[PDB]
Design a binder for these strands. Structure first.
Lengths: 191, 191
DNA sequence: AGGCCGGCGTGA
DNA sequence: GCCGGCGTGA
């Protein structure tokens, strides 16, 4: 899968704080998640070139090129070019905003295809910190399911009843039900 | 496959009986039903059409020797349906009724696991009648999707803006695109 | 059934 | 009327 140099004008709706993650080649690195919108659509965006973080909380309005598109999201990296438009801004329809902030219900998640990327906010019901992995049991009014966290998503401080906001998790099936697995760029923040 | 654990339910809906074809080319008759308990609702395929009255919905019924697969129930000739006594009565929360009436958003359907069985009501945007198959294009504010209808689901009269109610369609992926495929026990009625 | 790879018809 | 050969299907 390869880059798209067709440049896009989008508006930033949200960013996470920068955070540390490890590559399979054991390189220590820093990134942040962001959510951006056009008038018609929204995108989850991984920003690996953290020197643009300033550009992603102000200004809200930006132009992006040479980014990667996969897994229904955008990757912006060192090869990517981000610029500012001006003072000069536009506003995004509330349908799209609410959709970009939306969290799917667990009963629906259980019916979702393996390989999907999932973002959302869920309630922690139970936690088991094992040595390398942590199984977070998450819950809502429709069902419950396991979230396996490794790396930066291992051993996070939290207690039952707390709400976990997940970024960039991979949905996998066992046995006939969904679970959410942490990957290289996955993140968990508390509320 | 067979569950001898009997279920006590209230019938919320039935379709009229209808004709379908087996793979061994025998024409037969069946009907769909929607059922509920205190806990949750079920789609039901009833292959024994002599049970239509038991499913009229005036009564609360008990079902046994039914098959459970694809998140539905199949009641057939080898199954036993009887009536419940006066203390086994109950009413179903409007919560559950409304959930049983829920129709999924199409963009979410596209992300559902291959092989899922789908029921729902959708707005028809466009239809293409071929020789043996009919491509009904369904729409909502979220997205659009093809519904491939053959057999009893082929060449149904409908026009744009009509709502199609789908029963027991199979979700299939090809070239990374989701479609709803009509099958043996599938049904389409217009509103 | 984990996800992945390997075996038929369709159409070369 | 060829197989492979890739996303699908268990």
């Amino acid at each position: 899968n390869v880059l798209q140099k067709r440049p896009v004008i989008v508006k930033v709706l949200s960013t996470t704080k920068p955070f540390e993650y490890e590559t399979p080649e054991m390189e220590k690195k820093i990134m942040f998640h962001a959510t951006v919108a056009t008038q018609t659509q929204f995108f989850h965006v991984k920003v690996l070139n953290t020197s643009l973080k300033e550009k992603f909380n102000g200004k809200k309005i930006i132009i992006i090129s040479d980014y990667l598109e996969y897994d229904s999201l955008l990757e912006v990296n060192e090869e990517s070019t981000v610029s500012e438009a001006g003072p000069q801004t536009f506003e995004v329809p509330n349908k799209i905003i609410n959709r970009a902030k939306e969290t799917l219900k667990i009963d629906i998640l259980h019916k979702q295809a393996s390989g999907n990327i999932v973002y959302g906010v869920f309630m922690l019901h139970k936690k088991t910190v094992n040595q390398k992995t942590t199984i977070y049991e998450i819950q809502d009014d429709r069902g419950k399911m396991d979230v396996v966290g490794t790396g930066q998503c291992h051993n996070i401080p939290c207690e039952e009843g707390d709400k976990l906001q997940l970024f960039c998790f991979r949905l996998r099936k066992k046995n006939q039900m969904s679970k959410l697995i942490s990957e290289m760029h996955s993140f968990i923040q508390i509320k």
